[PDB]
Amino acid sequence: PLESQYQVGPLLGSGGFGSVYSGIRVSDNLPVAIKHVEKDRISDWGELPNGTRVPMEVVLLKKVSSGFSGVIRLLDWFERPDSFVLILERPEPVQDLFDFITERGALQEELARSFFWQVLEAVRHCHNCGVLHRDIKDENILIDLNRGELKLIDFGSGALLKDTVYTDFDGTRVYSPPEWIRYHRYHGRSAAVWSLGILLYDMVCGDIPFEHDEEIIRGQVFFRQRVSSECQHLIRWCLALRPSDRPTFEEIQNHPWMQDVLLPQETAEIHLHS
Ligand SMILES: Nc1ncnc2c1ncn2[C@@H]1O[C@H](COP(=O)(O)OP(=O)(O)NP(=O)(O)O)[C@@H](O)[C@H]1O
């Protein structure tokens, strides 16, 4: 075939590992996103079930692909001499959570509850498929505005999920746990939960709680916005200094603050004016 099975549009984002463009599949007009990653900027390399040297991002995306809309679907991929090109599904209209929060400010709790629940469902899907995202954050979450459905993207910092200790990290620092900062060691699940705590704080406060290593290590959370005691409790639990003190995914979803979540479509009708 050859890459030109697609019509390239505007640049949607860069600055992380790749440059992502809006595109359209010529065959059926399907909207897609075209992500380019330079071979020299790829942190971890992996190999495909059939024996081929490809970026870990392709390995992980293949492992999570399925009918579940919570994670972006990899449609196809290509290798060039100096890069890899990934063809991803693209919702329309769409907006990433960083832009959404930047534009709208702190989210009402009902909206944050729906968004956060969906992220949880998506991360649980990843882990059940043997994949650890390692870069959960606003920029890496897409909002399908008409459907009220959130989608996780950017597996460029990810890894295969394991139960032993990780001594490597290339995700976002200010989303990284204190055990990483101090000892360069963490376990996947508890680190994911720390990042979820940063994410939830960001949603209900409009910004992240910590900027410097010192603040991460201290782990003291201050609320600048009016946030319910149940939400505050959940956030502070996710941000426990000792990893074993953090809640499992099940405890998060069983937390009182998470009860009575809106359906995605309900969410869009009320908060995204469908
Ligand atoms: N499938 C998609 N559909 C629509 N927009 C996308 C899609 N993939 C990525 N984007 C946008 O492009 C940006 C960069 O995509 P991403 O896969 O995150 O690459 P990255 O530049 O390497 N860093 P990051 O934002 O930390 O993942 C995002 O923040 C999204 O705004």
From Swiss-Prot:
SUPFAM superfamilies: Protein kinase-like (PK-like) (SSF56112). InterPro entries: Kinase-like_dom_sf, PIM1/2/3, PIM_Ser/Thr_kinase, Prot_kinase_dom, Protein_kinase_ATP_BS, Ser/Thr_kinase_AS. Its cofactor is Mg(2+). Changing L161F: Decreased kinase activity. Changing H36Y: Increased kinase activity. One of its GO terms (molecular function) is transcription factor binding. Induction: By interferon-gamma (IFNG). Strongly induced in leukocytes by the JAK/STAT pathway in response to cytokines. Induced by different cellular stresses, heat shock and cytotoxic agents. GO terms for cellular component: cytoplasm; cytosol; nucleolus; nucleoplasm; nucleus; plasma membrane. CDD domains: STKc_PIM1. Expressed primarily in cells of the hematopoietic and germline lineages. Isoform 1 and isoform 2 are both expressed in prostate cancer cell lines. Keywords: Apoptosis, ATP-binding, Cell cycle, Cell membrane, Cytoplasm, Host-virus interaction, Kinase, Magnesium, Membrane, Metal-binding, Nucleotide-binding, Nucleus, Phosphoprotein, Proto-oncogene, Serine/threonine-protein kinase, Transferase, Ubl conjugation. Its EC number is 2.7.11.1. It catalyses: L-seryl-[protein] + ATP = O-phospho-L-seryl-[protein] + ADP + H(+); L-threonyl-[protein] + ATP = O-phospho-L-threonyl-[protein] + ADP + H(+). The active site is at D135. Changing Y21H: In a colorectal adenocarcinoma sample; somatic mutation. ATP binds at L12, G13, S14, G15, G16, F17, G18, S19, V20, K35, E89, D96. Interacts with RP9. Interacts with HSP90AA1, this interaction stabilizes PIM1 protein levels. Interacts (ubiquitinated form) with HSP70 and promotes its proteasomal degradation. PANTHER family: SERINE/THREONINE-PROTEIN KINASE PIM, SERINE_THREONINE-PROTEIN KINASE PIM-1. Proto-oncogene with serine/threonine kinase activity involved in cell survival and cell proliferation and thus providing a selective advantage in tumorigenesis. Exerts its oncogenic activity through: the regulation of MYC transcriptional activity, the regulation of cell cycle progression and by phosphorylation and inhibition of proapoptotic proteins (BAD, MAP3K5, FOXO3). Phosphorylation of MYC leads to an increase of MYC protein stability and thereby an increase of transcriptional activity. This is Serine/threonine-protein kinase pim-1. It comes from Homo sapiens.
